[PDB]
Amino acid sequence: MMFLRKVEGPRSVTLPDGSIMTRADLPPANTRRWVASRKIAVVRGVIYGLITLAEAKQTYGLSDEEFNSWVSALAEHGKDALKVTALKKYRQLLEHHHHHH
């Protein structure tokens, strides 16, 4: 089962403004203490780095409102609610990824 994203060598993803993080620092739903950086790392890590919210909800979904509260903290400006960086990208990307030339 191969994916369109050839990622393995990089090992770490870069968040829009949050440096690089690996697939090892991901809170495996359990975790111990969910701190701000810890929570924000989940939403940015799963959505921007690894998988879709389908898997991120089944694995890292914990409580749906809880997950929303992380995104809400990352939103700040909620007029459009779609202009949220992590969500806008996860939404816009589905409509034409790019075009390699």
Automatic annotation (TrEMBL):
Gene3D superfamilies: Winged helix-like DNA-binding domain superfamily/Winged helix DNA-binding domain (1.10.10.10). This is DUF1153 domain-containing protein. It comes from the Bacteria. GO terms for molecular function: sequence-specific DNA binding. InterPro entries: DUF1153, Trp_repressor/repl_initiator, WH-like_DNA-bd_sf. It holds the Pfam family DUF1153.
